[PDB]
Design a protein around this nucleic acid. Structure first.
Lengths: 79, 64, 50
RNA sequence: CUUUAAUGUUUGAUGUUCUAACGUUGACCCGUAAUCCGGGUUGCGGACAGUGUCUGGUGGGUAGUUUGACUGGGGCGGUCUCCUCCUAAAGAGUAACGGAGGAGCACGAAGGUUGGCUAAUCCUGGUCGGACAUCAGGAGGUUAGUGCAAUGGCAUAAGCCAGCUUGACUGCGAGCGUGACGGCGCGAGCAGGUGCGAAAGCAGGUCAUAGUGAUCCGGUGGUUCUGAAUGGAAGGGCCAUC
RNA sequence: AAUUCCUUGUCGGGUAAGUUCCGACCUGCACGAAUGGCGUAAUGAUGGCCAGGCUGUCUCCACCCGAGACUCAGUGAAAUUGAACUCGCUGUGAAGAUGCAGUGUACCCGCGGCAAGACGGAAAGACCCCGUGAACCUUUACUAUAGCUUGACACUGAACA
RNA sequence: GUUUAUUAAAAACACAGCACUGUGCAAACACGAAAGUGGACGUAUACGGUGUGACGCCUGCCCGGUGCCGGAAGGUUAAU
RNA sequence: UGUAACGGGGCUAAACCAUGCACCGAAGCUGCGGCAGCGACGCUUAUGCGUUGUUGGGUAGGGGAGCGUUCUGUAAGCCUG
RNA sequence: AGGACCGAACCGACUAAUGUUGAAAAAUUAGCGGAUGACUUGUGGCUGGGGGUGAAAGGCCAAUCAAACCGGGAGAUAGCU
RNA sequence: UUUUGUAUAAUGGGUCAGCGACUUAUAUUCUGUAGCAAGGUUAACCGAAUAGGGGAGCCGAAGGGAAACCGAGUCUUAACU
RNA sequence: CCAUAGGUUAAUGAGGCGAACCGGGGGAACUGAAACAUCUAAGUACCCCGAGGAAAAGAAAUCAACCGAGAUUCCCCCAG
C-alpha cells in the first residue's frame, strides 16, 4: 500500500548553553514539548505553555541536576 | 511611455518616512472565531515589508 | 462539525459581542457568561446567540 | 359592507359572430402584344396568421475553450494539506512511489482556582460474582491513566473527585524561537475589570505537539471617520464577525 | 466461425507427414434475428484449400541472342563534403575507434568488381515523452449561439354570452 | 456498377427490393440575414429523411434508461 | 575477429617481504630576468615615486581599462600627382 | 430484348518486372476489367472555403486539402532549439 | 554548441568574399561626473530664434494615521504607560 | 367617369479615377491574462458609404462651488 507521510518541526532542542548570556525572555529550551527533560527553577518558573523554558532575568544559563528524581533544571544566574 | 503602477499594490501598500512600505496583516478578514485573541490582536496593527519583498514592492510601485 | 458558531451579546446595551462554538444536541440551553465589555469597561452578562 | 332580471362604472381566461387593419403562392382588368411587380374589382381567411422587442425551454447544428502535477518513460494504480516516530550521522535541518500510524474534531466542562485523593496486576474467604461485577486483607509501585494516533512527559501530579466559578477577559507587550516571504509560535511584565483562595499566589483556555484556507467579492452588528455645491443619505473606511 | 482467449480444442477426411482446408461436436472467453439470422443458382482482376495439365519456381544451373556495364573519341552532371599524410587486432574511452594506448602489418599510384564499416547519404524521428503547443472530430464536459419552440406587449379592431 | 485521380478496388460504397417516419401544398425539407428559389410546373401509387440491402424461410422477448408521440389533474416555473 | 587478465620486449629476480642509501621525476618549490593587481609606511597633493609584503587556473556572471572601423567638429588646417 | 457473352477503338487500372538523382513529380512492357450503358467524350455553363461537391475515401476543389490559394492583421505567439 | 561528461560514431559548417543579431523612444531607480545649494529646474509656447522670456507645474526641505485630524511628533488605547 | 399610375420630349446636375488626412455604417482574430470564458488586443486591422482643402466639432438645457469662468479645436501639466 502507501505509508509515506510525515510532519514537520524546525527546532526541538535548547538554545541556551550554560555560558549563554540570555537576557529578558529568551527561550532557553523551546519545543522540548514537555516540562520533564528540563524544568525551570532559577529565574522563578518558566514553562509557560507548550512547556517552552524561558529566562526571566538578564543572565547566564545554568544547567543542573537537582531533586530526588535526578531531574534536569535550567537556571538563570546573574553575570 | 510613463510606467503604470500596479494599482492593486497601490491599494495594499503605503510608503513610510525612511523608505520601505507599510501593509496590513493577513488573516483578519475571515473565519475569526478559531483564532485566539492574542493572534488577532497582533494582526491588528500595520506591518513593514520585510527586505526580501521590498524589491517586488518597489518594482510594483514606481511612484510612491 | 456538529458544533456550530454562536454569538454572546452584551446585556449592557452595547453592540459588543463575543463568538464561540456550541452543540445544540447536547446543550440546547442558552449559554450565559460574565464577560468583559470593553465599551462599558465592566464585566457584564453575555447571553444572546445568533 | 358579500350579493340585485334597466342605471354611477373596471380588470383577466377561453367561446361565437362581424369587417375595417393584416394575409392571399384564388379569379378578372389595367400599366403591358410582361411567369415579376404595383394599382383596381371581387372571392376566401381574419384580428388569427405573420413580424419586431422582451422572455422560459430545447439546441454539438455551430463557436470558443478546458480536460492538473508527481511518477525510477508515460498510462493504470496510488499520492498532493496538517500531526507523531524512525530513516537522520548524540545541536537545528535533511530525500525516496522508504518503513509505520493518525487528523479535517471534542469540551461551558473535559476551562480557571481551592481543598482532597492515588493506580495496572496477582493471591485469598462470600447473593445468579462465574476465570473477570461488589467488599475486606496482603503483595506490588505507575507495569496504570491522559477525550482521540505516536513521541516526549507527568506524584509538587498535567491522572481521579468535590465546592465556588468564567482569565475560553479587553488593550498592550520588553524579549525571543521559527520561516525566502506571507506567516506561525512562546512570552515575563503594564493598565482596566474579574474569578478562586485566610494568604503567598494562580488563571489571557484544555499535558504539549494535528483538528486547517490567503486574497478578492459580498452579508450582519457597532462607529465624535469620510461622505465629490451645502444639509443629510447612498456608498466607502475602521472595529467585531460571517 | 472475417467472431473461440485457452488452442495447433477434440473427432473424421485429405497428405508419407496438414497450426491452413473441408465435415462435425458444443465446452458460444465474447453469434443471433432489418446494428438483420440462416441458406442461396448465377456473378467476382475477392479470401483460403485441393487436383489434372504445364513448366528454370526449384534440385542446380548451363549455353546462346540483343541493350548497358569495359576500351576509344566528343559533350558532360549529382547527392555529399570541418580538415586529412583516411590499416588490422586487443584494451581504453560520452560506455561499439582510421585517428587514444600497446602491438602487429603495410613500397608509391590507378583500373574493374563486392558492399562488412565509415553508428554511410536523404528527410531539425512520424513511434515514446514534454510544451499550462496547434488543428480537426466526439459527447451526457463548460460557456455561448443560429434554428425550433413558449408566453407578454405592439401592429390589432367592433359586438354578444 | 462505384471508390481513396499519386502505396488499399475490397468483404468497403452504391444498388433494385424491404420497412419506419415526416409531409394536405404557400407541403415537409434545403439554399438564403430577406426577397426568392429548388422540391415541382410534382400533389400521399407523390416527395424527403433514416436504417437494411436481389431472392427463399423468417425477424422472438424486454418501454426499466435515453429519444419520440399523446394527455394536463397536481407540483415547480420567465418576461409582465 | 588476433597473442589479448604485466602496456610490450622480456625477467627466476627485472617477483614478494624487511632495512638503508643514491638517483630520476611536475607548469609544485628554488635560482635569474620581466609584467600586472591589492595592501602597509616614507617624502605631502589632477603628487611623480620608492621601500616592503603578498597575489595573478577559470565557465555562467560582475567590475575595470583599452585597440580598431565609418561619420561630425578641429578642417579653406595638414599630407598628397 | 438484355445495366446479356467474347473481343478492337474508347474508358479504366488487378498482378509482375523495370525505372526510384526516372524517358515520366505515377510512367513503360507483358498480361488484366468494362466495352449499348448506373457507358464514354468534345464545347460552353453553374456550385466558392466551416463553403462547395462527394455510388463516401475525409475523397476532390489548378502536382496544395481533417479546411484551397493570394494579400493583409503580422515582426501573431514561441517558458523551445 | 549542448552537457554530469564529447576525439566522440551527438549538433552545425564544402570553401571564399560581402551582409547578418542587445537597438530606439519615453518613464523610473542607482552609480560616475557637472551646475546650483534649502532649494533645484522649467514643459507647451513666445522669440531676429541652441540666446532670452515663460516657474504652468514637477521633485525636495515633515511626518503619523484608514480618515477627519494632529504635527517633531503622530497613531494604538480609557491611558507617552 | 374625375384624377393618379404610366409614357414622350426638353433643361440642369450626377456617374468614374486618386497616396494620405476627416466623418459615418459595420467590425475581427492572433495576442496578453504566464491555461481560459468576463476582460484585453480594440473600436485596431479590414470592408463599405460620403466630403473637403482641411474634415469634424462649435456658441452652454457647459462646468464650477456660494467665489466665479464664459463657443469649438490643438499643445503642455494635472497624472499614471
Amino acid at each position: 500500500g502507501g505509508s509515506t507521510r510525515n510532519g514537520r518541526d524546525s527546532e526541538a532542542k535548547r538554545l541556551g548553553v550554560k555560558r549563554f548570556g540570555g537576557e529578558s525572555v529568551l527561550a532557553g529550551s523551546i519545543i522540548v514539548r514537555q516540562r520533564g527533560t528540563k524544568f525551570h527553577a532559577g529565574a522563578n518558573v518558566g514553562c509557560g505553555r507548550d512547556h517552552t523554558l524561558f529566562a526571566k532575568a538578564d543572565g547566564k544559563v545554568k544547567f543542573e541536576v537537582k531533586g530526588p528524581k535526578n531531574r534536569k533544571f535550567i537556571s538563570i544566574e546573574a553575570e | 511611455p510613463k510606467i503604470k503602477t500596479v494599482r492593486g499594490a497601490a491599494k495594499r501598500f503605503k510608503k513610510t518616512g525612511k523608505g520601505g512600505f507599510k501593509h496590513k496583516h493577513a488573516n483578519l478578514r475571515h473565519i475569526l472565531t478559531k483564532k485566539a485573541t492574542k493572534r488577532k490582536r497582533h494582526l491588528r496593527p500595520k506591518a513593514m515589508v520585510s527586505k526580501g519583498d521590498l524589491g517586488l514592492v518597489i518594482a510594483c510601485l514606481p511612484y510612491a | 462539525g456538529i458544533r456550530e458558531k454562536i454569538k454572546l451579546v452584551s446585556s449592557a446595551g452595547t453592540g459588543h459581542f463575543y463568538t464561540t462554538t456550541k452543540n445544540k444536541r447536547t446543550k440546547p440551553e442558552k449559554l450565559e457568561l460574565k464577560k468583559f465589555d470593553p465599551v462599558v469597561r465592566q464585566h457584564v452578562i453575555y447571553k444572546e446567540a445568533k
